[PDB]
Write a protein that binds this DNA or RNA. Structure first.
Ligand SMILES: [Mg+2]
Lengths: 138, 199, 175, 190, 109
RNA sequence: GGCUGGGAAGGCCCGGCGGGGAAGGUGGCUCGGCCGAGUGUUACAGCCCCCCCGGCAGCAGCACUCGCCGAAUCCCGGGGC
RNA sequence: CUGCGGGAUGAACCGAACGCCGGGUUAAGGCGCCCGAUGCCGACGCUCAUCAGACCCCAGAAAAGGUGUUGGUUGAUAUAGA
RNA sequence: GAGCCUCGGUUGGCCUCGGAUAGCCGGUCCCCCGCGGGGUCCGGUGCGGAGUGCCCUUCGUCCUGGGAAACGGGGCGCGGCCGGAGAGGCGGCCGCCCCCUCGCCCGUCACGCACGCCGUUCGUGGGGAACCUGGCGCUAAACCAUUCGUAGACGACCUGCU
């Protein structure tokens, strides 16, 4: 029932470490819990990276298991991994987290007012729909 | 301001240490569903350990000897007490803040209960290892009210299913109502998603 | 002797010149040590074990770290061991898969300590040689010699168990 | 060590239709339906190909002990398919020297009573697992037939009625008496 | 019109296993669980507020039953967000596991 | 600042030499709609990798943080007690 | 004839020796709770005990065995088919 | 309304079952069962946005003067229908009177502006004891003494007496 595999050319997201929050592609497998990784288009050099700190997405580009850092970059550019990643819900949620982190007190006040109006409007509509549903049931 | 924890799927000592530490810090902690507690190792190991504990008694007068409580909630209470300075006034005051129950009593059956990932079996224990349920262990050493607790828990779960069905209906109607008036809240939604909401 | 992240040092030494022997020969060794101070001590220990040379009667001519030639390529390293057990000593051959020779030696030390309870002082490193995909005896290294190698992460036990400690949601192990 | 990948496949016939509820195999066919939950085994249960022709089991990063589960689950699935297609029939013969063993089925085949075992006045009533029906075999003077879909239950009932007839406080090598399983086959051989 | 102090808990005094130093208190600030978020709270004023039987003076108000012991955050304590604090008078040890409010106005940001 | 007057790496690559994984190829077989996917066999390179001949600014222990030792070859600023 | 930190407990052990205090840092030892500190997104392996194991002095075990499991050494045969 | 003692605090979350080599949400064209439940299929997410890395509420007041939204709220608002028994001790659903124009964006001023200085801001009409207003209901039992022996060292125990 597995849909994600450690394959040569698999794109992985680094959860934590020096290159945290940066995409990277798997080149070759070093050991059970360590693989050679390369991130030419995401400012990541070629070095070993444990599987613990990486969570791999559903992007797989094809290149030989021991390419010399040049053909992997070409495949990354041809597949346009950056745009596809930016289009995914994962990157959008990460950006939402960052926006929440960078929100200032004035922005918090604006958000408070916006929610104050929006929740009231939505709950009024919900109450009206509940009354209509009760009328329909009877 | 009171912590309510669901005991199902939590390891005995792993949860007990955290609960004792929080209790010593003035926090009020309620532990619920103590029959769901599980202990590492096969059932026979823990059965033998509890029987060996049962053998411990004062030879001259067993009434003054150790008190072997059979209920799973009282077993968890004793394990937590073993991790507190209960001989001092501070330890007794802290232990007064702790409250354990078999099953989920009506006072807490309508509350959301938290779980501690640092004490869960799925996290702390290998999938190939064996474990024993505290309810079965208690039932085989003197516990009397396993079946009554099971029946009451079944009734409570049916009531919770009814409430959860109502909550699903409410949430679905809420989502539909948001779509209905999405034009009148476009400016309010845009500013919300500008600062990292609804994305 | 302790262990850390070992580095490969090339140490060259000779006995002090004497009127009898005006030009003594030069000897070199491959020493894997945390630093050069202990690398010199290990070189002297091995030379005294082999030759009739001591630190007082000799001198260190050159001591320098040996950098990895291809740090970006994965290689198979064969290490020949000579360690002491509770009983008599034994000879071993072990294979490891690492990017650097020093990393392979560190893995060898860790594996020896884990599997045979052998400390660093009891272990003597004889020869470390890089080997191709073939000529590998250990199936653990050989099972990774596959161009189309695939394996998922079945049971991803989550970390950050103490990042916010009380949560209403139970974690997830399938990704 | 840890094996990177170990797998085995089972080729089911076209008669049998198999489905999996994650890790629970439900097998149905001509004779009936058999269920067996394969939890607590931690294997990848894959059902590949159209018409569900083949069932594949996978095990990633397993040691020596966890490796045998791959073969044992395939064996269990094979037995389940054989039972749902052909079934299991166990024939057992009663052995005695002087006192004849009197065996009578009581309800349909579930309740079996054994009488006159070594002259004992005591009568053993043995209950069998659900889904297994016992009967008195014909064309043989003293033989019993056990039939069912699940091999485990039929074999367990056969073991129960084997252990019911046991000689106590005597040389078992000399007193070779009791009912013993003589043949392990299928109801229909085809 | 609202709360302008962070919640903290008097965990105990600075101590070893068998020796206790009462001139330095250990504080458990809520929401801080690492030795990297404690830099904000360094130097912050902290007070232990309590009530007593007799009335005392009150700055800018009528006499009340409230008395306080003022303090100051000194340094972090061991990778867990614990904070060492020093008060003008040592804490009564009755406030173990009780509320201590750390102010926000030794501001330096 | 030194080192292997750092080791590798990055870019345009050019004129070659051999060897090996085993591939836009062939092919016994298998799974789906000539193609897509999975295995093996001799195996050149249009997927590549490695050594030998040689040369360009593009370097720098490099904020693409892959692993050193450091300070008349070293100075400035800020925070807390 | 000697207090102090650690070894739960304590003659001789480890560190270290004493005027009354404030600040900082260590030794030997530790950092799930008792109990100060790993609430590191620590690293690599080994181990299932129906008598598990858990730190000088020290508070307990031997010879002999085990296809239980994990590594090493030697020796043969296997497409002329084990 | 004062009047003594004792303290904790400084917005709440009113809730499925649950598995981890898997799960969450709808429609369910289809089938079965008692508006709902179960199954097949289909469609969306899954390092969880139907995320506790979360949601809910604003934490200055008042005048009038506009736009968007809008019949919402309150008078411990008064009367009926219920759910809840594990240790219920809380809420849900309907009738009638009066009052207010509360949420969001901008005009418009005025609120001891106490001239920099700390326990501000609440759950709280907090909990315990003694005294000042009214409406609705109350009338004792226990023990000693006596008596009895199913009881007994003495207490205690079983009994009787307008
Ligand atoms: Mg107050």
């Amino acid at each position: 029932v597995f849909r994600r595999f450690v394959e040569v050319g698999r794109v992985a997201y680094v959860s934590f470490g020096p290159h945290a929050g940066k995409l990277v592609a798997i080149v070759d497998v070093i050991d059970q819990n360590r693989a050679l990784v390369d991130g030419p288009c995401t400012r990541v050099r070629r070095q070993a990276m444990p599987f613990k700190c990486m969570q791999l997405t559903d992007f797989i580009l094809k290149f030989p298991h021991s390419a010399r850092q040049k053909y992997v970059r070409k495949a990354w550019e041809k597949a346009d991994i950056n745009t596809k990643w930016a289009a995914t819900r994962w990157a959008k949620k990460i950006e939402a987290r960052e926006r929440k982190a960078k929100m200032t007190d004035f922005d918090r006040y604006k958000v408070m007012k916006a929610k104050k109006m929006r929740n009231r409007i939505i709950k009024n509509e919900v109450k009206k729909l509940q009354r209509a549903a009760l009328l329909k049931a009877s | 301001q009171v912590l309510v924890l669901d005991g199902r799927g939590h390891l005995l000592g792993r949860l007990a240490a955290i609960v004792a530490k929080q209790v010593l810090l003035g926090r009020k902690v309620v532990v619920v569903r103590c029959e769901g507690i599980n202990i590492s190792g096969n059932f026979y190991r823990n059965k033998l350990k509890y029987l060996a504990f049962l053998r411990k008694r004062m030879n001259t007068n067993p009434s003054r000897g150790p008190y072997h409580f059979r209920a799973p909630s009282r077993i968890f209470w004793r394990t937590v007490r073993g991790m507190l300075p209960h001989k001092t006034k501070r330890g007794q005051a802290a232990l007064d803040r702790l409250k354990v129950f078999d099953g989920i009593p009506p006072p807490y059956d309508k509350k959301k209960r938290m779980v501690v990932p640092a004490a869960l079996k799925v996290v702390r224990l290998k999938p190939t290892r064996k474990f024993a349920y505290l309810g079965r262990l208690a039932h085989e050493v003197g516990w009397k009210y396993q079946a009554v607790t099971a029946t009451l828990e079944e009734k409570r779960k049916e009531k919770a299913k009814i409430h959860y069905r109502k909550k699903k209906q409410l949430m679905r109607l809420r989502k539909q109502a948001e779509k209905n008036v999405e034009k009148k809240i476009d400016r309010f939604t845009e500013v919300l998603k500008t600062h990292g909401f609804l994305v | 002797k302790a262990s850390g992240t070992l580095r490969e040092y090339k140490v060259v030494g000779r006995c002090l010149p004497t009127p009898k022997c005006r030009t003594p020969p030069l000897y070199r060794m491959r020493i894997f040590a945390p630093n050069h101070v202990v690398a010199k001590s290990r070189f002297w220990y091995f030379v005294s074990q082999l030759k009739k040379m001591k630190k007082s009667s000799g001198e260190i001519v050159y001591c320098g770290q040996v950098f990895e030639k291809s740090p970006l390529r994965v290689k198979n390293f064969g290490i020949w061991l000579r360690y002491d057990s509770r009983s008599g000593t034994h000879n071993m051959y072990r294979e490891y898969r690492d990017l650097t020779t020093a990393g392979a030696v560190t893995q060898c030390y860790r594996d020896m300590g884990a599997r045979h309870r052998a400390r660093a002082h009891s272990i003597q490193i004889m020869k470390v040689e890089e080997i191709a995909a073939s000529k590998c005896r250990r199936p653990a290294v050989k099972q990774f010699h596959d161009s189309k190698i695939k394996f998922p992460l079945p049971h991803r036990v989550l970390r950050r168990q103490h990042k916010p400690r009380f949560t209403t949601k139970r974690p997830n192990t399938f990704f | 060590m840890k094996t990177i990948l170990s797998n085995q496949t089972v080729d089911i016939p076209e008669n049998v239709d198999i489905s999996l509820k994650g890790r629970t195999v439900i097998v149905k066919g001509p004779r009936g339906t058999l269920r067996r939950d394969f939890n607590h085994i931690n294997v990848e249960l894959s059902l590949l190909g159209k018409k569900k022709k083949r069932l594949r089991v996978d095990k990633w990063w397993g040691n020596r002990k966890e490796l045998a589960t791959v073969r044992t689950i395939c064996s269990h699935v094979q037995n389940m398919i054989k039972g749902v297609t052909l079934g299991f029939r166990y024939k057992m013969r009663s052995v005695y020297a002087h006192f004849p063993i009197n065996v009578v089925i009581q309800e349909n085949g579930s309740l079996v009573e054994i009488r006159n075992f070594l002259g004992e006045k005591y009568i053993r009533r043995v209950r069998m697992r659900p889904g297994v029906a016992c009967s008195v075999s014909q064309a043989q003077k003293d033989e019993l037939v056990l039939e069912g879909n699940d091999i485990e239950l039929v074999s367990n009932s056969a073991a129960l009625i084997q252990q019911a007839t046991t000689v106590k406080n005597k040389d078992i090598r000399k007193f070779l008496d009791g009912i013993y399983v003589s043949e392990k086959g299928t109801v229909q051989q085809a | 019109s609202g709360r302008l102090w962070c919640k903290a808990i008097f965990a105990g005094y600075k101590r070893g296993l068998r020796n206790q130093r009462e001139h330095t208190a250990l504080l458990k600030i809520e929401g801080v669980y690492a030795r990297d978020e404690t830099e904000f709270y360094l130097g912050k004023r902290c007070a232990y507020v309590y009530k007593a039987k007799n009335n005392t003076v009150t700055p800018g108000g009528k006499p009340n039953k409230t008395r306080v012991i003022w303090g100051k955050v000194t340094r972090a304590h061991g990778n867990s967000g614990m904070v060492r604090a020093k008060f003008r008078s040592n804490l009564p040890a009755k406030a173990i596991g009780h509320r201590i409010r750390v102010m926000l106005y030794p501001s330096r940001i």
